[PDB]
């Protein structure tokens, strides 16, 4: 969930940071799969 209020702000900032981390992780995984399919097609054409 989400929430000495300075450490509360630091916790919410770290929570937003980790949310951005897993978001970018999913985006990079899907984009890496797309790039791998593209270069597999390119390698098939060159071979």
């Amino acid at each position: 969930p989400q929430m000495d209020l300075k450490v509360l702000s630091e916790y919410s900032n770290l929570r937003k940071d980790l949310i951005l981390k897993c978001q970018a992780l999913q985006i990079g995984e899907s984009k890496l799969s797309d790039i791998l399919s593209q270069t597999n097609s390119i390698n098939s054409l060159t071979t």
């Binding site: 450490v7 916790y11 770290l14 940071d17 980790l18 981390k21 897993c22 992780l25």
Partner: protein, 50 residues
């Protein structure tokens, strides 16, 4: 009895203080802090950064 009244009053002091320091020991082992959680989230941030 006046020398006895001080001992029985200090006995109830040393009982409830040892009781409540036991109660906060079992409770905080079943609760969470705002420091170890941030340390674990720092570790998780390092792992996801890697």
């Amino acid at each position: 009895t006046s020398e006895l009244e001080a001992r029985i009053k200090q006995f109830f002091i040393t009982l409830r203080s040892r009781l409540l320091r036991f109660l906060e020991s079992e409770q905080l082992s079943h609760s969470l802090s705002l420091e170890t959680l941030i340390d674990a989230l720092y570790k998780i941030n390092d792992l996801l950064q890697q």
